[PDB]
Design a protein around this ligand. Structure first.
Ligand SMILES: CCCCCCCCCCCCCCCCCC(=O)OC[C@H](COP(=O)(O)OCCN)OC(=O)CCCCCCCCCCCCCCCCC
Ligand SMILES: CCCCCCCCCCCCCCCCCCCC(=O)O[C@H](COC(=O)CCCCCCCCCCCCCC)COP(=O)(O)OCCN
Ligand SMILES: CCCCCCCCCCCCCCCCCCCC(=O)O[C@H](COC(=O)CCCCCCCCCCCCCC)COP(=O)(O)OCCN
Ligand SMILES: CCCCCCCCCCCCCCCCCCCC(=O)O[C@H](COC(=O)CCCCCCCCCCCCCC)COP(=O)(O)OCCN
Ligand SMILES: CCCCCCCCCCCCCCCCCCCC(=O)O[C@H](COC(=O)CCCCCCCCCCCCCC)COP(=O)(O)OCCN
Ligand SMILES: CCCCCCCCCCCCCCCCCCCC(=O)O[C@H](COC(=O)CCCCCCCCCCCCCC)COP(=O)(O)OCCN
Ligand SMILES: CCCCCCCCCCCCCCCCCCCC(=O)O[C@H](COC(=O)CCCCCCCCCCCCCC)COP(=O)(O)OCCN
Ligand SMILES: CCCCCCCCCCCCCCCCCCCC(=O)O[C@H](COC(=O)CCCCCCCCCCCCCC)COP(=O)(O)OCCN
Ligand SMILES: CCCCCCCCCCCCCCCCCCCC(=O)O[C@H](COC(=O)CCCCCCCCCCCCCC)COP(=O)(O)OCCN
Ligand SMILES: CCCCCCCCCCCCCCCCCC(=O)OC[C@H](CO)OC(=O)CCCCCCCCCCCCCCCCC
Ligand SMILES: CC(C)CCC[C@@H](C)[C@H]1CC[C@H]2[C@@H]3CC=C4C[C@@H](O)CC[C@]4(C)[C@H]3CC[C@]12C
Ligand SMILES: CC(C)CCC[C@@H](C)[C@H]1CC[C@H]2[C@@H]3CC=C4C[C@@H](O)CC[C@]4(C)[C@H]3CC[C@]12C
Ligand SMILES: CC(C)CCC[C@@H](C)[C@H]1CC[C@H]2[C@@H]3CC=C4C[C@@H](O)CC[C@]4(C)[C@H]3CC[C@]12C
Ligand SMILES: CC(C)CCC[C@@H](C)[C@H]1CC[C@H]2[C@@H]3CC=C4C[C@@H](O)CC[C@]4(C)[C@H]3CC[C@]12C
Ligand SMILES: CC(C)CCC[C@@H](C)[C@H]1CC[C@H]2[C@@H]3CC=C4C[C@@H](O)CC[C@]4(C)[C@H]3CC[C@]12C
Lengths: 341, 341, 341, 341
């Protein structure tokens, strides 16, 4: 049913499943925009494949060939099957457009699924090659961040009564994690552009290329005179393929700019979460995180992403907002907060 | 079966699934009226698509073409398939109404599903872009609210024996959350109006536009004299489409006023929950929450929504009701309550 | 299978599913008679729809038209499909009863499902609009009730060795909850009466209205002389529809008095649970709950319903029964009970 | 459906299921590259088998034989069935290419599944023969490693206020675990090369080898003159087999170099995790793990793999990175860490 495909591929959490493992519990490891780009770019061709053969659009078989009236039911079935298998053998069939459109019309579902798989590959390589490293580092950085905030509030309360920073400075040096990231993004962009080219070509087909003339006259049927010289076959469901092909092309050409934008990782590093903790006195008062094609920018993005899960950040952010209001003071209201755990 | 679709799409919690995650446990993040508007506007076209092809309304195929009696079974099948695929190729078919109604009759399920997806998009953007921010803020505000009530009752009991307010004042300034909200609501309204226009057009079709004349005379069949010049084809299940189209149009034109009403976020801010805590002496005695196209109004709505889950509010509300009765006193009965946790 | 439908729709807890949420755990929020009225009034048309197309009653298609013997298999299929789609187009078909019975015979399942949905709507509005308010209030009232009993037994034991009442007095004033309740009940009664009228009309159809004469002579077939002027079509499964229609009408006309009886909410307030606690000295010795079209009567009904879950009520009730026996004394046996938790 | 196969065989965790047992919880026991090599090499032929008979590529039966028009429906069915069963009996059928291509065309799915099973066997032998030994040893080594780090930090803190090494030296001697490992890898490589040879042969078939002449003239039909001497049969879905055969060959010839690379187990031992603990004073300052076709190299690889799960390693690694930054000192920041458990 058309509605079941809808549920399964848009309304269900298809490819939105969190890692079924206690190792990554609430850690994202994939920027939300990357997750949605992958979800669209991969699930859309699958949904389109499923729609192209929905029982309420499909009339029946994919090919029909109009045998003579003298032919029995089984002879007509033979003609259909032979011509279907003969879209490959170029000698038997004669079409105005050529054989390549016939190939493309027969194997449209396979090509769309191939594009889905190729678009799924780079996210897989990211999830299996570079995800655990950043998961461990980000989790450790968040724990140390919490410890730093605890030290600051403990010092403030005691007055009333930077290992993580250096690790960040270290990550500022290496660029393994960023070349991996932009390589997956670049491959996604390349595959999306190749898919756009292919779909634009396919939609541009003559729309009469689904009609080809086929001849079952190889072998001993060559001498058979009860068999006409050639049959008029038509590939049903090519119009559906071309309509779905233009839909896919529209979505992919809208999606490509998003991938290109993600390609600029430093530009996206904005709304510095580190600034909030920099407001705290104990932590060094510097952003110390921007302006480079280095793993530090990646870690900044992933910190902005997974930073909402730590309650210490939440408290410090609301304190910074009150500072924007500018009514009280940071240490007094922080001691009033009482949000250590 | 018709009853299975009924269960699945009205009696099951379809699109009423709470977030399967410990991050949002009992926090709504979507106003009930918005949830029901989305549920209707999205599930209704899906239920209608499923009904239009229920096995007890569907007679069989979607098209039938009345080949000559001389035609064999397979030749008639060829005619049906060719004309079905030929509702796209405008040269072959000749209809009194035109080709656009034929296109619309073939692809009615796809268009309804497209409307379902487009109506599902704005709630998705809300759930993924702006939901976590408000979830964290609302949860923190409720925790701080409980702490304020605990301080008030502790002071009262001790006599017997405003960080959250400033955060609210801060939210009164920014308008990111409200422009996001009214943008999703406005897109929902725009898509619903476009869908109403389309369905009103479709239901207005001639009801004889499902009869078209089709001609399988391209290619080598042009010289074929055993093939009549043209066939009388009829698109079955167009009457069902038009009946379901008017049902959908009725529901959507009833739904549009609800969306417009939700568009006025300040007007909906009523029955101030903040007033109850304002009755408490320790908290500032002011509503300090109304009258603006600012994130404060949104937070007021979401507070009214998720406010029942905190037991402290429940106790203070029953105390306010007793005040409406006006028998005892607030602090004495509050100390009698003993509802700290 | 007929037995699977039986299990699913009578023997399973269909629409008897308790709220899958920790917010309402054991709280009913719907009077048992209302639950059964909704279950019947909604599930019966669905079960009837499923039965009308059970594989052991259905002979095959829904319509058959008796084409001439000269017609091929596919021409006969065209005739069936055309006439099926032509029960809408009034110009083609000529029936003795009219076109409205033909419409009604084709769309009987849809009309029954429409009635099921309309009857499901008022319980949905109750469950989503007014259920949480009463859930919170009733739960709080029960907790306070338990606290009052604990205070009474503690005072009695100490001798050996009314916030909830005022909240009840407050609820005696407002009438929002009761107008909502009687509005849902009144809409259920109105829809049930409209459904009874429709089913009584439908069962009164001529029983020969399923035979109509149909003519496939529009378009180019008008000039076709191999096509007879008109065909004798018959809508199979109309007798089944009418039999199931009278079954549904019988059940609904038996159900309407039950809805009317529920409409008198004060009359149903009986066997005062408050009287038991009134027997206790510490609580005020008054029922203080009856005789009004006010939310207090609703709360009385829901208290009588959800009152069995509190063990304190159970103990006090057995003490009251012993008082009916009149052997010992209330405080002594209450202290002997030892049922604080 | 083509999309269901996609989900099941690429997007689901097919053969990525962690051991459903509390014995191995988070221990990998299979290097990630080996896991992906097995997953590809085994799941690809299964996905290809499922695709070759997808309902949207399959026209119908696998063979059709073009009986005379005089033949009834059942006689034609007999011809199809006889020739299908007669691709084995070499006497009846006469083909230009020979009988071996006919055998190969009939049993292509079975051969692909045979390759899948043979490629699944070596990982099974590894999982059942040698996995528990290394699981127990690695887990014990990690526990002892943690104890060594705890002793070092305890000594450092006390100043402020090698059983696992010898087991490693012992493992440096035996070579049972490494000959088992390279034997499974070598069998995987051998089977992959044999499969590549077979698929390259199969794709090189004449593409007209699917047309064979078949004769139902054994037994009493020999004297039957109503039966023609021979029939023209065609094996449909051979073009699909050859296309999928070249896809499989491409993937396997890309996969073989990966297996060969895994075959060099010492070369892969890189980024010594032991070096980090060697930086600690209490542990012996030596890698003492490299350069041999001995079980020590295997244990090094598996240690690098399962080493992220121990938090002690994480702390020591970030300390080593800070040493790379060279700001503070190892013992002071280690005592500051406070990551014993
Ligand atoms: C700059 C980076 C750009 C990356 C672009 C990626 C594009 C997408 C590719 C998708 C391919 C399918 C998905 C693969 C996901 C998993 C890959 C993976 O985890 O590879 C890790 C592998 C480990 O190799 P190993 O010898 O075990 O060394 C590390 C342990 N000591 O690493 C290896 O080196 C093994 C594989 C190659 C082996 C050598 C081949 C040449 C000989
Ligand atoms: C991305 C998908 C790839 C599509 C692009 C293919 C371009 C091939 C260009 C070569 C064409 C060529 O040599 O000419 C034709 C050969 O086609 C052929 O005989 C080969 C047809 C191409 C095969 C494409 C089939 C897709 C199968 C993918 C399956 C993937 C499965 C994944 C699970 C002959 O024809 P002509 O028209 O030139 O003759 C009249 C002369 N002008
Ligand atoms: C916006 C996307 C629309 C793109 C359409 C532009 C090309 C129109 C081509 C001619 C117009 C027409 O109706 O004829 C067919 C195209 O129709 C079509 O197939 C047009 C249908 C477009 C449907 C798009 C609706 C939703 C868009 C995305 C939603 C998300 C021709 O057919 P042909 O292209 O084979 O012949 C070669 C065409 N030069
Ligand atoms: C929202 C859905 C969009 C419906 C509105 C489409 C309006 C198109 C207006 C252009 C019409 C046009 O140029 O004229 C017709 C072209 O139709 C065509 O050949 C194009 C037909 C329009 C394509 C609509 C098919 C819907 C497919 C959506 C799939 C979405 C899938 C989502 C998963 C020719 O005909 P004529 O009658 O003018 O000739 C007799 C002359 N008067
Ligand atoms: C209230 C909604 C009713 C709207 C109906 C108003 C238009 C009536 C059109 C003519 C009357 C009729 O029976 O003929 C067909 C419409 O019937 C129909 O199709 C009317 C059936 C209406 C069923 C609605 C019942 C439930 C409403 C919503 C429940 C939730 C014509 O057919 P046409 O419209 O194609 O020809 C162009 C029509 N000017
Ligand atoms: C509750 C269900 C509603 C049933 C009651 C409908 C009463 C309509 C009265 C108008 C009848 C009318 O104008 O006359 C007929 C028009 O029927 C028509 O052409 C319209 C037929 C009525 C449409 C009912 C179809 C039900 C579809 C509901 C779908 C709901 C789906 C929910 C998911 C023509 O005929 P005539 O006999 O007067 O001619 C011979 C003259 N006397
Ligand atoms: C008690 C409910 C019984 C109501 C029946 C009263 C009306 C009888 C109508 C004529 C008698 C008969 O057998 O002929 C058909 C009705 O039979 C029938 O269809 C009668 C079958 C009744 C089955 C009810 C058994 C279980 C009742 C509820 C269980 C829960 C006529 O058919 P028509 O009514 O179309 O022609 C117009 C009828 N004046
Ligand atoms: C790996 C799969 C194995 C494929 C390689 C088989 C090579 C066999 C070579 C022997 C061939 C032979 O003796 O000649 C043919 C015999 O074929 C035969 O009659 C035997 C055909 C080979 C059987 C292969 C069938 C695969 C079944 C596998 C099932 C596995 C199931 C697992 C669950 C006769 O023919 P000719 O052409 O020489 O005659 C014209 C003369 N030149
Ligand atoms: C890269 C892989 C491409 C390998 C193709 C090279 C051989 C071409 C053979 C002739 C060209 C052609 O179109 O004719 C058929 C092959 O086409 C085909 O079957 C070519 C289709 C290739 C599809 C590959 C697309 C995706 C590749 C892997 C994705 C992962 C012949 O057919 P034949 O080979 O039976 O006759 C004996 C051929 N000398
Ligand atoms: C956020 C992570 C989940 C994204 C889900 C997107 C919808 C989906 O699962 O699916 C959406 C769907 C493809 O599945 O795309 C469609 O039909 C709608 C396409 C809309 C436009 C896409 C490009 C925007 C730039
Ligand atoms: C990502 C964006 C740029 C994609 C836009 C679609 C492009 C790639 C499409 C749309 C129209 C297409 C062209 C239409 C017709 C022809 C003529 C043919 O003999 C060769 C291919 C060629 C030249 C196509 C190449 C691809 C094409 C240019
Ligand atoms: C949301 C509300 C306003 C929707 C009401 C339905 C409207 C949009 C429908 C109902 C009748 C429809 C009209 C019926 C007939 C025609 C004539 C045709 O040649 C052009 C379209 C046009 C002019 C339609 C436009 C859309 C229409 C006006
Ligand atoms: C979803 C949105 C786009 C729907 C908008 C309404 C669509 C479905 C309908 C409503 C009225 C329709 C128009 C009515 C009449 C004509 C004149 C004709 O000579 C060309 C098509 C054209 C111009 C139609 C195009 C499609 C149209 C605009
Ligand atoms: C709830 C109770 C009262 C329902 C009882 C069934 C009633 C509503 C049924 C039973 C018989 C029915 C009548 C039978 C025949 C006709 C004649 C027709 O030309 C108009 C409708 C009319 C007049 C029907 C109206 C509805 C009807 C009166
Ligand atoms: C792993 C790599 C090397 C695989 C490459 C494919 C190889 C094995 C394939 C491709 C072409 C194939 C050849 C094509 C044609 C013939 C002629 C035939 O009479 C005997 C087999 C023989 C000689 C095939 C042997 C296998 C072959 C050489």
């Amino acid at each position: 049913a058309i509605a079941q495909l809808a549920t399964e591929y848009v309304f269900s959490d298809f490819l939105l499943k969190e890692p079924t493992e206690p190792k990554f519990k609430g850690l994202r490891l994939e920027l939300a925009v990357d997750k949605m780009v992958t979800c669209i770019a991969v699930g859309l061709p699958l949904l389109l494949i499923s729609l192209a053969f929905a029982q309420e659009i499909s009339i029946g078989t994919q090919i029909s060939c109009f045998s003579p009236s003298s032919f029995s039911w089984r002879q007509a079935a033979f003609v259909d099957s032979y011509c279907w298998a003969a879209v490959q053998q170029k000698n038997s069939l004669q079409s105005e457009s050529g054989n390549l459109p016939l190939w493309l019309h027969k194997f449209f579902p396979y090509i769309l699924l191939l594009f889905a798989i190729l678009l799924y590959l780079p996210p897989l390589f990211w999830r299996f090659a570079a995800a655990p490293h950043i998961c461990s580092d980000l989790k450790f950085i968040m724990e140390e961040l919490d410890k730093v905030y605890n030290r600051a509030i403990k010092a403030a309360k005691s007055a009333r009564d930077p290992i993580v920073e250096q690790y960040l400075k270290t990550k500022k040096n290496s660029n393994n994690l960023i070349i991996k990231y932009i390589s997956c993004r670049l491959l996604t962009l390349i595959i999306i552009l190749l898919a756009c080219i292919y779909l634009g070509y396919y939609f541009s087909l003559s729309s009469l290329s689904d009609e080809f003339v086929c001849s079952i006259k190889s072998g001993i049927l060559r001498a058979d005179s009860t068999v006409p010289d050639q049959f008029q076959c038509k590939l049903i469901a090519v119009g559906i393929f071309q309509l779905l092909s233009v839909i896919n092309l529209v979505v992919y050409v809208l999606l490509a700019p998003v991938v290109v934008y993600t390609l600029f990782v430093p530009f996206r590093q904005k709304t510095d979460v580190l600034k909030v903790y920099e407001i705290l006195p104990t932590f060094d008062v510097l952003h110390f995180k921007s302006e480079g094609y280095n793993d530090l920018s990646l870690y900044n993005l992933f910190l902005e992403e997974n930073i909402s899960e730590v309650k210490s950040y939440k408290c410090l952010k609301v304190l910074e907002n009150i500072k924007s209001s500018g009514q009280g003071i940071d240490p007094m209201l922080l001691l009033t907060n009482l949000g250590m755990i």
